[PDB]
Design a protein around this nucleic acid. Sequence first.
RNA 1: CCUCCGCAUAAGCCUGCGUCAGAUCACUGACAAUUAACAGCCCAAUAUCUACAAUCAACCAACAAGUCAUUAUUACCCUCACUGUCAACCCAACAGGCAUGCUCAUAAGGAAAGGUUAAAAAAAGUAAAAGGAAACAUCACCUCUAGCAUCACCAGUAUUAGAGGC
RNA 2: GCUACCUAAGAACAGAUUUAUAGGUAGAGGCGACAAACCUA
RNA 3: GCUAAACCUAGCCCCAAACCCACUCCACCUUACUACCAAACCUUAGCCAAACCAUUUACAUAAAGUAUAGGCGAUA
Lengths: 97, 117, 211, 41, 43, 176, 139, 26, 192
Amino acid sequence: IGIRLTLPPPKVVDRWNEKRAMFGVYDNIGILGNFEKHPKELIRGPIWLRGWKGNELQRCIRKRKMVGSRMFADDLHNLNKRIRYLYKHFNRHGKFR
Amino acid sequence: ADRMSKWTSKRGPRSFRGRKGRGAKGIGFLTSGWRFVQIKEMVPEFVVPDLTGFKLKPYVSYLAPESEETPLTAAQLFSEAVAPAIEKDFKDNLEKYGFEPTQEGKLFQLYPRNFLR
Amino acid sequence: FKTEKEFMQHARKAGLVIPPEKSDRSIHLACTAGIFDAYVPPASQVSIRRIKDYDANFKIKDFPEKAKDIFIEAHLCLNNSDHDRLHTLVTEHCFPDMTWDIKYKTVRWSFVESLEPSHVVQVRCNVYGQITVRMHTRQTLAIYDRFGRLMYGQEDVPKDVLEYVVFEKQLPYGSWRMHTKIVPPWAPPKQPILKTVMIPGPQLKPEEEYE
Amino acid sequence: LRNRVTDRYFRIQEVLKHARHFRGRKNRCYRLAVRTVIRAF
Amino acid sequence: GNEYQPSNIKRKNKHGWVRRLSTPAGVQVILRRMLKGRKSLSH
Amino acid sequence: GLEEFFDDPKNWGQEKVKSGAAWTCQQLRNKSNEDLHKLWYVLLKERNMLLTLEQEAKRQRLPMPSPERLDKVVDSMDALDKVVQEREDALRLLQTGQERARPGAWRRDIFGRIIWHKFKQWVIPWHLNKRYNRKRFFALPYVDHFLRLEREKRARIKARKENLERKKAKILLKKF
Amino acid sequence: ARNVVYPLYRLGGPQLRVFRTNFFIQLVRPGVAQPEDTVQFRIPMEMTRVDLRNYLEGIYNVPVAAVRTRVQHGSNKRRDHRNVRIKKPDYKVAYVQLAHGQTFTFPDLFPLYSMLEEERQQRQSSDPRRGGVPSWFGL
Amino acid sequence: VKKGFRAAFRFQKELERQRLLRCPPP
Amino acid sequence: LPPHYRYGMSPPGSVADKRKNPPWIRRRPVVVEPISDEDWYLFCGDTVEILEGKDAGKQGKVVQVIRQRNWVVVGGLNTHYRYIGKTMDYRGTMIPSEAPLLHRQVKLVDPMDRKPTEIEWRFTEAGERVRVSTRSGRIIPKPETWIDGPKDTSVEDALERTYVPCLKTLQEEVMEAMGIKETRKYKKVYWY
RNA sequence: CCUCCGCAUAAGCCUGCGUCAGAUCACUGACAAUUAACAGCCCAAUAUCUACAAUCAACCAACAAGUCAUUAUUACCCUCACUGUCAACCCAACAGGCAUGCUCAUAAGGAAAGGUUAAAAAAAGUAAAAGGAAACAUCACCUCUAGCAUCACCAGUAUUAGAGGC
RNA sequence: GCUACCUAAGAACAGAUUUAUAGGUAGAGGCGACAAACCUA
RNA sequence: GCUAAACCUAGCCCCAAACCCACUCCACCUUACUACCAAACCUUAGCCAAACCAUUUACAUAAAGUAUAGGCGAUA
Ligand SMILES: [Mg+2]
Ligand SMILES: [Mg+2]
Ligand SMILES: [Mg+2]
Ligand SMILES: [Mg+2]
Ligand SMILES: [Mg+2]
Ligand SMILES: [Mg+2]
Ligand SMILES: [Mg+2]
Ligand SMILES: [Mg+2]
Ligand SMILES: [Mg+2]
Ligand SMILES: [Mg+2]
């Protein structure tokens, strides 16, 4: 059917462990540190999208203009494909016109 | 309409069977009348020595001890072979030591190799 | 299949060569298929001397009753229907000899005070000695089964039971465990169940003839 | 998903248990159940 | 209908490796199968 | 003498052939070259005995009397071959020093990949070799997209294995 | 002489001898009835018929007279759990008919338990008059 | 194969009620 | 064997293993806890003690060690009692067959203190790697013949250093012995 | 009682009703097979002859105008290697085809009736009185273009080559 | 590689015949006794 | 009651970093998986959107989506 059969694995999760303990510690970095470095650098994440959060089409546009010459050919053709798709997607057919 | 098998003997027509063969080495030549002449020159020649009186049996007894795996290092073997000749000669032109300019005249040359297995 | 030889012959006919795998691990069994010497009931101090070399602390007369208590535990092993202390109590040669017919049935048997006291008779000897006690106690047994019908064994009145129950002690860290139970050819007949069971004749097929 | 539709047998048993006195194949399955039970209420 | 009346000589002709490698587009075909990673890289 | 094509008739039916261990390589390395030839021939005879016995065992559909003996003789013969190869390699290193025993090279083939081709001993010369000149060992620019694609597949397998290993490690540390 | 390139030979080269020929051999019992004066073998995939004569003359000095070659293709109707065509080991077989009236027959090769032996024969089987009652109890 | 920890508990409660209705205890 | 093929206490290639873990299965793997490569702290036959389970505290001996499942077979305890010879009508025979135990589930025994001792595979002047106890200053070593056959070569024969190093080939030395008088040499061809 | 088939080689497939055991109108695993004179696999240079069909080939009788030959000179010695050989076989519908050599029903090969009953409607066959139907190509011809050569036309020359009409 | 048309080089008995085998003509095409037909359901 | 259900965990996901792949012996461009005689570059095209169709049209942050250009009609 569509249910489980027994009670599932017991969710051993310590909500108070170290790798979550400092979650945002030293993360008011800018005005609480005499303006040396903004929070706009403290994020450890991909350089395609580290803090210019536009739309989906914008997301891909930034991915291209940042790292396109660093992809295998499948990713380049893929990013080009969806970029063409989205450029057609924005201004063609929708609810508000 | 089948392809995944190997290309061994049985594939198609007569001559299509005729050319290829399994893993032999050729022995002769094809001359007139579709007659093959195979020379004793190009044939395999397996001349083993006489086995009588060699005391080394095919298996080795387990009562013997073990040793260390001493690979035949080229510098080590070269030193062990050339040490006495060089020691006497320096106490006394590598042709006396047997250095080979070319192996063009030897039966068993090395580069290319003409020996077998 | 009939035995190992029949399986091997039908294996050769089936072509299934059982490949010999070389393994150092074996079975460290601690039971004996039989006993070293069975004392036939109606000079054996060499076995006692050989046993004292390993244990060095053994009183024969006090060895019986606790073993009888262990034998009583065997009755408890049926009365509690608890194979746990059974496997913790007796030999593996006795576990099939005490359970494979005993299972899938109800037994509420018990022992009571001896008609005749048990006497130690046997002594024996990869080392496992065997000591037997001849006991005539009171028994209260009943064969209840899947139907729940208590079928073989009187209801409440105990009966005199004499037999040469032989336990065995191997030589590691264990102690005496129940080996077997000697019954002489001069033993009295048993009381069977009240059910009548047919012994089928030699079943002739439609082709042959009946003698 | 980041969340799939997990409460089905509870939902269907909430559906069919107010019409379990019918006849025919509609004693069982959710589509027949909804149609007849809706009519009945 | 019995259209597929194949023959081994013509098979290794029209589907072999030498002919499939004679013009560089076929070399590209070989490479396309290779990055596709099949087994029957030719016929 | 065909009598050696079967094993010793005395040991037949004994369910096991009491044979020693294989000759140690360095221990075998102390024997003469003529002795090496003797050892190789004795190994050939025993190995033939092994092959005939095993095939007959299949023909009789029964177990093997000395199953480890065949592979042991094979292993000892392989060790003797290793010693022979070591001596021939010492000869090739001393006398000329070329690395791969056959003369050959690294080049590129019509599939565009980098490989090492082997030259073959053949009579006629490379300025007239009617077959070797047919060997199209040239690649024009039409191999680019496929070559980089091959790089892409290699990288995909690489990142796949790395992710699998490190995530398996993370689950492993979670188990402690 | 398998698994190696033999040396190139010209019109008048030296006799290309061997040192330790790797081409092992296996001669089995005949399967169908055969004449007496020939013994066959499952030679490996490489050597020639005259090579078989030479290898026999080296190993045992047999009087080789006739030599025979037949290429038994391995079968290809047997599948694995992935359901693929997996051809068997194909084999080329050979036969040397030996001379001087010798005729070699196939050798007729290949011509804890006691505890179970004290158990299986010592079953002490259930009596019909017992009727399923357990015999561990003696009463 | 719903990754979740509650609807299981709901179905377990229903099945336990079913077990109680299967044969009521003494 | 197969990728992530589950090994067991039976032989690593057994037919009974193929009736246990056949090649056609892709089963669920077990989580193997990785110990250090020089730190397989069990030796075949050594006395140890099970710190857990029924009959814990006794002394046993680990005989079988399949490092793949990373479990220890300490015979003497930790056994089930199962019938063997399950034939059509044969009564069978009950045997106490013993299963594995985990490396963290048992502790090695101190050879002098007679206690469950966790030891470190440390270094010594005589021995580069050896298990060394912390509760006591003792090193635990690993604990523990051939009649010559008709095809068995003796050690006396095996003591001959007959490989006198020459500058000639093995084929060359043999032909020097064999007397194969060489008339022609090879002709020089190219490398096409 | 059937056999306008059958037996072979050819092609083409790939061990596919051989043997010992399992149980899946009542296939699976292991073991064994096909030992060449037939057929392929070839042919040491440079030049030089090679009009006189075949049809039983002697006549007649032709047109569509012929499907097969060395020789000269130089150089050259050593012999039996390798690979196909099986089979109830191949392409398709879920009616059919298969090139070639022999036997024109035969020496080889094969079985349309699972068992019964004897309905109609249908299908096939037998029997029935009395009557006996109640356009494209093309030969021929015409027209038009083209005065000529080394990859077609053509190795040709306006009685030629190509294109339209009836 | 079926079929359409052609080449090479064979076969059967009476041509505008069929066919064993290789080879050639690729779609913006070829082929076409032109059926506005074919060239892999 | 049977068929059935259900179960984790294989490994995939994206990123971070980092430049990687190519010789057991062998054989492998002829009919690829057989030991052997006398030749390469020459502009991508096209729709779509113009509510049909034609010129036109893509295959770090900030100035700035302003200056340039549009059957001056769509936008880039
Ligand atoms: Mg042959
Ligand atoms: Mg011939
Ligand atoms: Mg045949
Ligand atoms: Mg007949
Ligand atoms: Mg029939
Ligand atoms: Mg009928
Ligand atoms: Mg009429
Ligand atoms: Mg009439
Ligand atoms: Mg064609
Ligand atoms: Mg428009």
